[PDB]
């Protein structure tokens, strides 16, 4: 009927919030996962779009390329900063992913695919800003691999990222408390 | 029960702990700062100071350097393991703030290295070209940044580590 009084356990303030703080402020791992999916689809669409048109994504979006970074649209620079900070989990990494207590990707695997996507996307965008060359052209130049031999390998990436972006992942999200 | 915070998110208990990461991060802070300072003193990027070939495509660069860049990048995003937690003790910088300064240093270092490989220009010169700000107006701010990383690399940070 009446519950016994519980000796209140010393609650732990976890340092996994915005820039590491413990004040419960910042993205959860779920938020990060979503943002990561958006980056997966964006990166994939960038590569596919360039593979089809021959033009980088920023060029297709009517933005100036082949310019120093300080001349680029500040909104683009902000998106790049956001993407990078998110990739390293600086915008908050609150909570945990755990195995479903009881054979594809787990939610954490998904999270890391998302972070890799964020890195590659940010790097490719900065690259296009400075050089005027899209992610595919950059890949061709830096790998030494001819375009015809790099196209299928890139198409495999587009498919990989697209599938990953829709895959929920196994396991469950758990709040710090 | 089984946390997914190990190597590439695995729960097997394989991978770096947050402490390992923090250490690697300190090493990164010191490396980055020392490379900036070194460019200031020598006028040459760190890779040129180490006499490594620059102004070249990535695939022609030394495999150990590329190894190091990948390692640094994967470490920055926690893919090499992020096991355990940092919690408040039951300036003001916690070990988590420290971890993120380290990750920032890792991103910046990796960036500058790839940039130097491709362009043959050190981090300071990259900064100059990409901000429009003259080198002489740049160096004080960078020196301040250099002092910060050295301070952070040595600062233990408050809080503790839980398994
Ligand atoms: C030593 C380990 C090593 C590691 C861990 C990395 C890690 C990374 N590299 Mg670098 N790289 C290396 C050595 C390494 N590289 C060497 C030796 C070269 C010269 C060819 C390059 C040239 C290179 C380029 C141009 C790029 C990367 C990229 C990458 C990323 C992943 C892509 C990848 O793994 O393909 C690496 C390729 C292999 C590991 C080759 C497969 C190995 C099989 C086992 C052996 C094949 C040898 C040969 C073909 C067999 C016949 C021998 C002879 C007849 C030729 C990551 C940053 C890319 C990136 O920036 O992110 C995506 C990128 O664009 N790498
Ligand atoms: C760079 C592209 C996106 C810019 C801003 C990202 C805002 C992050 C919020 O994420 C939220 O996290 C939840 C997790 O489940 C989702 O359910 C929810 O729908 C989603 O809104
Ligand atoms: C609880 C687990 C749910 C996992 C799967 C959720 C779907 C995530 C897909 O992201 C989508 O990315 C696009 C970016 O271009 C947007 O158009 C679109 O609005 C956005 O929804
Ligand atoms: C240029 C190479 C990259 C950096 C070296 C990687 C070593 C990773 C192991 O971390 C360990 O974590 C502890 C945390 O407390 C430290 O005390 C300890 O000394 C350290 O060994
Ligand atoms: C300081 C941290 C890392 C340890 C090793 C530093 C690398 C510098 C050594 O130069 C070596 O000699 C020649 C000149 O660069 C090159 O032909 C060769 O590629 C390179 O191997
Ligand atoms: Hg030499």
Swiss-Prot record, chain A:
Query: Membrane-spanning regions, if any?
Result: 38-58, 72-92, 111-131, 146-166
Q: Where in the cell is it found?
A: Plastid, Chloroplast thylakoid membrane
Q: Give the free-text PTM comment from the record.
A: The N-terminus is blocked.
GO cellular component terms listed in the entry, alphabetical order: chloroplast thylakoid membrane; photosystem II
Q: Does the keyword Transmembrane apply?
A: yes
What's one GO BP annotation on this UniProt entry? Answer: photosynthesis
Where are the annotated sequence repeats, by residue? Answer: 1-100, 101-177
What keywords were assigned to this record?
A: Chloroplast, Membrane, Photosynthesis, Photosystem II, Plastid, Repeat, Thylakoid, Transit peptide, Transmembrane, Transmembrane helix
| Bilayer topology term | Multi-pass membrane protein
Chief place of localization: plastid
Q: Which GO terms describe its molecular function?
A: identical protein binding; phosphoprotein binding
Summarize the protein's role. Answer: Seems to be involved in non-photochemical quenching, a process maintains the balance between dissipation and utilization of light energy to minimize generation of oxidizing molecules, thereby protecting the plant against photo-oxidative damage.
Concerning its family, UniProt says: Belongs to the ELIP/psbS family.
Q: What is this protein called?
A: Photosystem II 22 kDa protein, chloroplastic
Tell me the organism's taxonomic lineage: Eukaryota, Viridiplantae, Streptophyta, Embryophyta, Tracheophyta
Query: Source gene?
Result: PSBS
Q: Which residues of the full protein are shown?
A: 68 to 270 of 274
